[PDB]
Amino acid sequence: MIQLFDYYNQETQDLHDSLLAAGYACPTIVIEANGFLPDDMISPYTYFLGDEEGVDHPLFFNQVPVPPFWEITGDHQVARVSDMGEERARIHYASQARGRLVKQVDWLDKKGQLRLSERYNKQGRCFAKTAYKSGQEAFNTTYYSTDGQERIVENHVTGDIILTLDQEPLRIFKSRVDFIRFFLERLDLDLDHILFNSLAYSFLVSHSLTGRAGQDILFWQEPLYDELPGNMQLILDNSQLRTQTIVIPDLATYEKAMSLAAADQQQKFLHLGYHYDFKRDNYLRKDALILTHSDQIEGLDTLVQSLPQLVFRIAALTEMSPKLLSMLSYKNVVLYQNASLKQIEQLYLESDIYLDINHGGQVLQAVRKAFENNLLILGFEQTLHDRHYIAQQHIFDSSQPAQLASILEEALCGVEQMRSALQAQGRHANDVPVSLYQETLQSLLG
Amino acid sequence: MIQLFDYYNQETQDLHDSLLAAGYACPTIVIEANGFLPDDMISPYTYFLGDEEGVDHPLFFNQVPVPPFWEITGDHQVARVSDMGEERARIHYASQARGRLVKQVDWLDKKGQLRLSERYNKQGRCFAKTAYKSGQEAFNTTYYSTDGQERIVENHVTGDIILTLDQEPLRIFKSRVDFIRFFLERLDLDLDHILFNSLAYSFLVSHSLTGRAGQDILFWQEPLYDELPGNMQLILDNSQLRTQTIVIPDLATYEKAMSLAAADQQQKFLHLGYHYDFKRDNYLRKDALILTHSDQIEGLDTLVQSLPQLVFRIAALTEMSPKLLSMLSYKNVVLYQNASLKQIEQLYLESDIYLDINHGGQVLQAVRKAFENNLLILGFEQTLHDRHYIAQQHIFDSSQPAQLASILEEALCGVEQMRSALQAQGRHANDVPVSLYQETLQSLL
Amino acid sequence: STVYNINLGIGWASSGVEYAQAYRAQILRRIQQPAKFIFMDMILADNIQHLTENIGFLDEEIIWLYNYFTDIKIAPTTVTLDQVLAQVAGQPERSEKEGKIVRYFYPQDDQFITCYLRQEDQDFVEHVEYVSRGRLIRKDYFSYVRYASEYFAPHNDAATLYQRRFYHEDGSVAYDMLIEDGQEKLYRFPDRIFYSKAELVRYFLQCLQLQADDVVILDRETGIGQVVFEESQKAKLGVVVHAEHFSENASSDDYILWNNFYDYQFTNADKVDFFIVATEAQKRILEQQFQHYSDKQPQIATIPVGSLDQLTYPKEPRKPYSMITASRLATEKHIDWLVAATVQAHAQLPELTLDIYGKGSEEDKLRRRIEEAGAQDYIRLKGHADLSQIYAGYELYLTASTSEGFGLTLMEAVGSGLPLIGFDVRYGNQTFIDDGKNGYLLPVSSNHVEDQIIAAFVEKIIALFSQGRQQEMSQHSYQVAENYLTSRVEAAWTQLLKEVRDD
Amino acid sequence: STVYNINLGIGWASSGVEYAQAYRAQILRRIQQPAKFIFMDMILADNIQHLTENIGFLDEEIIWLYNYFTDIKIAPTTVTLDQVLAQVAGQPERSEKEGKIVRYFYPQDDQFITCYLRQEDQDFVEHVEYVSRGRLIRKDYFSYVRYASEYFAPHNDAATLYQRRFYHEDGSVAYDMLIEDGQEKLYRFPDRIFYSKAELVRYFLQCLQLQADDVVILDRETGIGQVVFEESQKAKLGVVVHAEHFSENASSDDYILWNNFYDYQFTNADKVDFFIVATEAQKRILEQQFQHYSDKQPQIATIPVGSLDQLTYPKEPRKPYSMITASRLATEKHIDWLVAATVQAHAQLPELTLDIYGKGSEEDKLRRRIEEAGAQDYIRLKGHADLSQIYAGYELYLTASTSEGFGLTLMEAVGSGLPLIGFDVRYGNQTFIDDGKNGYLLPVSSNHVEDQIIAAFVEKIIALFSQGRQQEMSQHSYQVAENYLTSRVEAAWTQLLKEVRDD
Numbered sequence A: 001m002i003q004l005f006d007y008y009n010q011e012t013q014d015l016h017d018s019l020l021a022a023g024y025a026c027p028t029i030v031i032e033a034n035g036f037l038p039d040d041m042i043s044p045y046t047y048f049l050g051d052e053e054g055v056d057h058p059l060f061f062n063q064v065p066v067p068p069f070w071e072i073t074g075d076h077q078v079a080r081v082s083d084m085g086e087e088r089a090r091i092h093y094a095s096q097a098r099g100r101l102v103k104q105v106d107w108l109d110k111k112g113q114l115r116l117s118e119r120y121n122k123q124g125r126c127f128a129k130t131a132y133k134s135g136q137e138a139f140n141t142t143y144y145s146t147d148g149q150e151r152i153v154e155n156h157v158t159g160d161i162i163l164t165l166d167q168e169p170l171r172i173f174k175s176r177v178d179f180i181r182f183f184l185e186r187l188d189l190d191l192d193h194i195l196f197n198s199l200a201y202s203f204l205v206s207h208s209l210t211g212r213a214g215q216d217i218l219f220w221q222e223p224l225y226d227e228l229p230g231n232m233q234l235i236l237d238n239s240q241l242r243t244q245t246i247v248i249p250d251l252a253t254y255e256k257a258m259s260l261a262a263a264d265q266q267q268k269f270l271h272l273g274y275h276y277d278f279k280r281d282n283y284l285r286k287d288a289l290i291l292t293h294s295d296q297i298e299g300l301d302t303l304v305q306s307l308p309q310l311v312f313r314i315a316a317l318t319e320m321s322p323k324l325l326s327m328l329s330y331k332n333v334v335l336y337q338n339a340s341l342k343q344i345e346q347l348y349l350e351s352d353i354y355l356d357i358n359h360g361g362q363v364l365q366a367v368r369k370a371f372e373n374n375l376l377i378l379g380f381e382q383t384l385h386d387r388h389y390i391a392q393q394h395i396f397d398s399s400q401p402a403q404l405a406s407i408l409e410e411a412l413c414g415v416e417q418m419r420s421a422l423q424a425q426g427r428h429a430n431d432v433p434v435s436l437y438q439e440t441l442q443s444l445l446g
Numbered sequence B: 001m002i003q004l005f006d007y008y009n010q011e012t013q014d015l016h017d018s019l020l021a022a023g024y025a026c027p028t029i030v031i032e033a034n035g036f037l038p039d040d041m042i043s044p045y046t047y048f049l050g051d052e053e054g055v056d057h058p059l060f061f062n063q064v065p066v067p068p069f070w071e072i073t074g075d076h077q078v079a080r081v082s083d084m085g086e087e088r089a090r091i092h093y094a095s096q097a098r099g100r101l102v103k104q105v106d107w108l109d110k111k112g113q114l115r116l117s118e119r120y121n122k123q124g125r126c127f128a129k130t131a132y133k134s135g136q137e138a139f140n141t142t143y144y145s146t147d148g149q150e151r152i153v154e155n156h157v158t159g160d161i162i163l164t165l166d167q168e169p170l171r172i173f174k175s176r177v178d179f180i181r182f183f184l185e186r187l188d189l190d191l192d193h194i195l196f197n198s199l200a201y202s203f204l205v206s207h208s209l210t211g212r213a214g215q216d217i218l219f220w221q222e223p224l225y226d227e228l229p230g231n232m233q234l235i236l237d238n239s240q241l242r243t244q245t246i247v248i249p250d251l252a253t254y255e256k257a258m259s260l261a262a263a264d265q266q267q268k269f270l271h272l273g274y275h276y277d278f279k280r281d282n283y284l285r286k287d288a289l290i291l292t293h294s295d296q297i298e299g300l301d302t303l304v305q306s307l308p309q310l311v312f313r314i315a316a317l318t319e320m321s322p323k324l325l326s327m328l329s330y331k332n333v334v335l336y337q338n339a340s341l342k343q344i345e346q347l348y349l350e351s352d353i354y355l356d357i358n359h360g361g362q363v364l365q366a367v368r369k370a371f372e373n374n375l376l377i378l379g380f381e382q383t384l385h386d387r388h389y390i391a392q393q394h395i396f397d398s399s400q401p402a403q404l405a406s407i408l409e410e411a412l413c414g415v416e417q418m419r420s421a422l423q424a425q426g427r428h429a430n431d432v433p434v435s436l437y438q439e440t441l442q443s444l445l
Numbered sequence C, D: 001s002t003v004y005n006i007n008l009g010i011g012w013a014s015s016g017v018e019y020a021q022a023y024r025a026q027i028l029r030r031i032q033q034p035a036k037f038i039f040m041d042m043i044l045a046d047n048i049q050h051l052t053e054n055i056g057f058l059d060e061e062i063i064w065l066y067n068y069f070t071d072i073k074i075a076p077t078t079v080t081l082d083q084v085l086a087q088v089a090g091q092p093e094r095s096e097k098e099g100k101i102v103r104y105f106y107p108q109d110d111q112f113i114t115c116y117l118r119q120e121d122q123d124f125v126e127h128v129e130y131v132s133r134g135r136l137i138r139k140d141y142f143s144y145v146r147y148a149s150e151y152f153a154p155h156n157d158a159a160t161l162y163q164r165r166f167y168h169e170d171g172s173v174a175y176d177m178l179i180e181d182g183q184e185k186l187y188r189f190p191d192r193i194f195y196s197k198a199e200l201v202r203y204f205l206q207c208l209q210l211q212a213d214d215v216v217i218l219d220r221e222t223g224i225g226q227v228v229f230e231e232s233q234k235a236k237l238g239v240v241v242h243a244e245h246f247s248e249n250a251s252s253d254d255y256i257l258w259n260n261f262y263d264y265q266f267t268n269a270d271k272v273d274f275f276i277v278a279t280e281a282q283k284r285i286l287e288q289q290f291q292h293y294s295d296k297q298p299q300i301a302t303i304p305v306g307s308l309d310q311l312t313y314p315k316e317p318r319k320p321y322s323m324i325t326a327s328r329l330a331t332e333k334h335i336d337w338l339v340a341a342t343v344q345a346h347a348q349l350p351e352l353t354l355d356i357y358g359k360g361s362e363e364d365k366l367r368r369r370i371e372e373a374g375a376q377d378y379i380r381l382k383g384h385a386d387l388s389q390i391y392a393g394y395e396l397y398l399t400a401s402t403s404e405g406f407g408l409t410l411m412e413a414v415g416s417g418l419p420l421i422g423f424d425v426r427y428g429n430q431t432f433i434d435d436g437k438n439g440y441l442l443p444v445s446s447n448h449v450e451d452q453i454i455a456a457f458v459e460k461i462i463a464l465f466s467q468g469r470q471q472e473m474s475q476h477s478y479q480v481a482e483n484y485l486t487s488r489v490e491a492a493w494t495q496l497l498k499e500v501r502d503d
């Protein structure tokens, strides 16, 4: 009875939640070295360090300890430290939406090459150092106690691990997987059934546990192209193995899956989705939004004169280019600038419509925050990532005729109109009711 | 009559040496920038600076002005400067008898890139800084005062030479050539016949002055191969040019050069050597001398066994390596540890034989002084330049005829048998009596 | 002792940060405390000195970083046209001129001189360039002699600066620097060598030989911030914050996003012995923000960055219904909207003037505005000139600036008594206007949407011109000008100095 | 106030620099002068302590550079194998003993421990090798707690050392370093980062907090001397000089060459307060040379290497007509020539037995020649014994020394009163012998001319034995030994202590 997740990304968390609403609360294990973990879940690296639980206080880019008088810089994309103006440290910001929160800090040699990497948690002090050899090759990663007494030392080359716990004999493992099994035997978890999202080590622990009592399920997510991986068809031509069933939430994959290897495998290909948590309803206001890291936004000059009924809110906390300020002379359009990390969501509160015509990088995972807030997503072939949550019917041509997107969006002036138009976009990402999870996952221990 | 040489050479120095013996006393100008020129000469770059003529106190390696505490490192063939051991500056040495005298001092950056060079004269002024750009290319050269003022700026891209002298108006020269033509007129130097060693800038000064009266002479110390330099063809056909006649010394280089020329072409050359005066005659000793830096000598032992009769004198200015000490077991092997300039010219006098088998590179032009004292200069291949003085009769390879190397010297017993092997080398260096220079140029006064 | 003041650079048109020093200088001249104003930036386009004297400085009060190393000390350019052409071989015949430029010709060998005059009608020469055959090989800069020279060379058919140099009065080489692509690299002194301009200032401060009670005052951090701190802890150090000091937008109660100009000092504040701002309003905000966030309690004073020698009365007839504005003339000042408020005020009250004094960004797209818009000769874009009595001759003042730490342009307006119209925001706007008397403050939605703000602007403009308040709120502006006056400005300083020298 | 001493490294087999420095501690102990001796080079293969003990050092006079940051104190190895097996998980099967090499096996998994013993009989472990799958991974060093570790990794199937970590008494990390190409490229504290081991020493010197009341002494410039000088000018600095400072055969009246180990200090000598030489003759010859080549005049003090508690007075039989000497039988000793001093002299001088006390290689050149020569039984041949006593039971000490800047073979040879014979050469052979009193000097042609002095050695010996000065000058040997007693050395070492701290 375990959630085993190899890496953390938002594409994982959507599994944690869908099972949570479907009523599976079982212990959760993460292979990755992440320190920002939402406290519902633990990792074999972070358990034995000894920091506290329920404390979210990262370090601010200016706080990272540095030698006397040495000068810190940060731009809200990255941060840097310079002895006499010369680059020494790189600081990378957390995956977190909040700007200027410290995840990893890399130091460079006198020649600019990478040497040391000191990772940071969500609790605000350095919990691991990573070392590099020569050509920027990974060497080892040291893990520290709270006091800094050595606890975990992993040698990336061989794969061996050193465990010196507090006032504890020294064990030396061999492979990453052997350590994982030691972490499920140290906590005495219910191993009745195990859930995992990848063909990586998380999958491998299922292969190491092959004899043990239980059956296991793989939720496969990552996209497929022309052939199934060899570690995948391994469950299809073998029987005994702990994992007996493959669940694919995205249908575009579930359709291509049964489309390769013939005969029986279509039994152990099931189909599900992710029951989300929507944060609010639509309300059908006339107010819209586009988020832009890069001026400009194609097709734009057309659509403003096209529907004077409505208002365009487009912004960057970056400095605005003077070419987009010329559009302001059309007074249906307001421009926001240099937005508070609570004032970005001011637009996501008062906008019901988001349009990916942006040409540059999605900022702050813009498409996704619109989806959770139900903002109807409409765009072109020049849309952004992730294009996961957008229905094909709402996708349109790249700079080519843009007013089909108008009179089709204009068609949502009624409540029944928006509701029916959302559900297409709703089930693009395979939103399902919590009922479907009860049925499909009732077949195993409940 | 003046001498104009591009660059100061062991080539040129023995050329200006031999001319004095014929009574032709002409002044000497060098287009090169060197500061170690002996007291006879001057250069356009060095004259106006005001460096006191005749003085010798070159800077010792550890006197080069350095920042506080910055450490100056040791001396064999090079010296170096460091901040916390990080390599900063190189001191390139001079070429002279006592070592570790400053010729060039280069600096760097934290990346090891080239940047500045500050040259020194035989006095040791910081008289030329030199700057270098991105690709480690050149840029310009400032020839300084002794007071720190500006005199000459040669901009190495365009070539434009900015000359701002003391109390005088500012001039700008289109290239290095016009600078030469300018420098001459002020010194009031008679041009009626002129001598130069380089197809380079030394040559272009004539083609400018073709109208002024007289005739000029070009000298070839540089080897040829297959075809002539393009400027050499111009000397053949053109006449009104001040230069009507070319000169090559070498018994080899003369005819292989005239091989490429028609019946018309040949009559404009004359062939002749140099005059080396030797501090003493031969006197057919049985003794031998070798000067190295470190170990070791190829076939050094196999020769020790192939001759009992005479001593093998090997010496070093560095405390010697044990491989050399082991050979001392035998009576004909004598070393000299950390030997002294006092001990040096004694060993050159006690021996009649020099052997260039020493690995590494030459010792203060030991080869040249081997030829000057009329020893028997010889060796294998993989020798030490200069090869300028050795013949083919006396040379071998890879210690293979190390046995007949012996017999060649053993063939010299008769008092004048050595002299037959001697003046084989004596014509390879093209040694010829000054009676020859006089007969050739009595037409050319 | 002495008081050293560190500022990067200066122009003719230089910012109010730079003016603060100038005002601050004449302050110290009357307290019997000597000082020096250091300038790190490369100043070539004109002579350093004409910029110094221009803003009110005294020549012997300025230490120019690239100067002080030499014996030549700052001074106006005394060199005649004839003095240079006497330094050249031969003579010219043909001679051109345009603007500040003179070009002599000696084209027997293809060479000539491009000369740069300090100003047109005079014969004094700032720059002298030499071009042979069509390439630039040397350029000489002048004050009373040759105080530096640049050398060049072609790259991709372009003038390219490779090495510079500096000279003494005797024409001796102090140091020459090398240039790789617009950035200095190395400095050749006879006794030293350096690979970074940061570590050159380290040598400059080091040779200044600061004593126990010496004072180093930081204005601009940029690029020198680190090298200032390390080498100043011998003496007492201080940093004065001229602009707004953080971003309230991206700040939670947990996190405070500072301003890059001052960040390195706030993080490391402990090393600094004192801090300075102007409105005590700013003090209590920051100093409270200071302890709640990073829990550091440095000593922070309150001093105005420009004063009144005396408050001015404009004897000559009070010019009717006049407006005036001045600033860096940039995006931040929002000069655009002022141009929008007047042409419609040109309606109900014609003839009323407005004057724009400044040099900077987008002056052009303002001049592009009035030609087409409804002011033919109704507005004056006069550049940046001396306003010493000029404010006094105009009826009202306008600032559309969104934030100002002090905003001296209206500090010099309340010395003319003039009424004021602007937004209600920290700091200088919430200092120099109490809406009841003198001027008017406008609350502002946090947004820029044209229709809202410009219309409310003239709402309180015409309640003044017509009528009754333009006479007596000119005196209240005077009575609040009494608050910041040199007698008080000189006061806070003199004590604060030995307040630090206490220890 | 303290006195700090600096040197590169140390080991079982040591050189004259350390024992001179080791003795230097014992004197400074009776001075009531607190002394610390700083060692730099990385010392692992044996513990740092065990090599301080056997040269005699006191553990609290030992500041090890790479130890200084760890709160561990310098300690001998107290750690057993049983203490080790308690930190390891599992139980061993095979236990091999090859020597000090003790290899435990756990073939249950693929891990095994090779363990290193201090002494094959003892329970004492210095360092541990943990290995998985035949691939070495971690190595660990012990004094009273693990104070250091190394981390390896295969390269071309060869275990290659990469990073090395130093711990605290509680097991927490003090700092770590990166090794590329056997070189130390980066050090990381929690508060610091270091790219140059050269610059690392600078951190050490600012952590020691040197006041002016302190004193610094440098032995080898190699690896340090630049930064040492720079950080030492707060306090008082001095450079000791052992062996020869120059090479005369390379130097003329115009220029002077120093030794590569002494060249930096001498050239920059003006920063160093004082210099220390072995002898007085070295103090004078150097002092003579200094003021000539470059005009700079540092102060020089004379101090000996070792010393003597008591002049060693015999009542034993004083065996007339005998010889004695002590060296290692090295080719530098040129003692192959001392063999004919015995065999040619014997014809005139009956019954003279010299004694050989030394051990080195190419020694069988000495045992091979003595026998084929006419007299093979005249002279004994023996490796070593405790020398300090025997001397008085022989007559004259014989020295073939080319040059020795100092020696205590002759320092203890004037302890028992023996007359000595050595060449006139720098220095010790020249400072214990005046050709008129107590011995004879043999100036050498600049050459090794074998038979030239082959008799000239034999010559002077018979002047001692025939006769009458045989003991006359040997009693004078106590008058010269008097000045070097361990009582007067203690006088100059404290008088020097005020010859520095006074001004």
Ligand SMILES: O=c1ccn([C@@H]2O[C@H](COP(=O)(O)OP(=O)(O)O)[C@@H](O)[C@H]2O)c(=O)[nH]1
Binding pocket: C015, C016, C017, C019, C306, C326, C327, C328, C357, C358, C383, C384, C385, C386, C387, C406, C407, C408, C409, C410, C412
């Ligand atoms: O025409 C002008 C405009 C500006 N100023 C000076 O420039 C300063 C502008 O300062 P302000 O604070 O208003 O602008 P900022 O500091 O933001 O650049 C004022 O103090 C004036 O003394 C001037 O002398 N003449």
Ligand SMILES: CC(=O)N[C@@H]1[C@@H](O)[C@H](O)[C@@H](CO)O[C@H]1O
Binding pocket: C016, C017, C020, C241, C242, C243, C244, C278, C305, C403, C404, C405, C406, C407, C408, C428
């Ligand atoms: C926009 C702004 O903040 N401008 C301020 C100005 O108000 C102040 O008078 C001056 C001197 O401190 O510093 C500037 O930065």
Ligand SMILES: [Mg+2]
Binding pocket: A083
């Ligand atoms: Mg530093």
Ligand SMILES: [Mg+2]
Binding pocket: B083
């Ligand atoms: Mg330094």
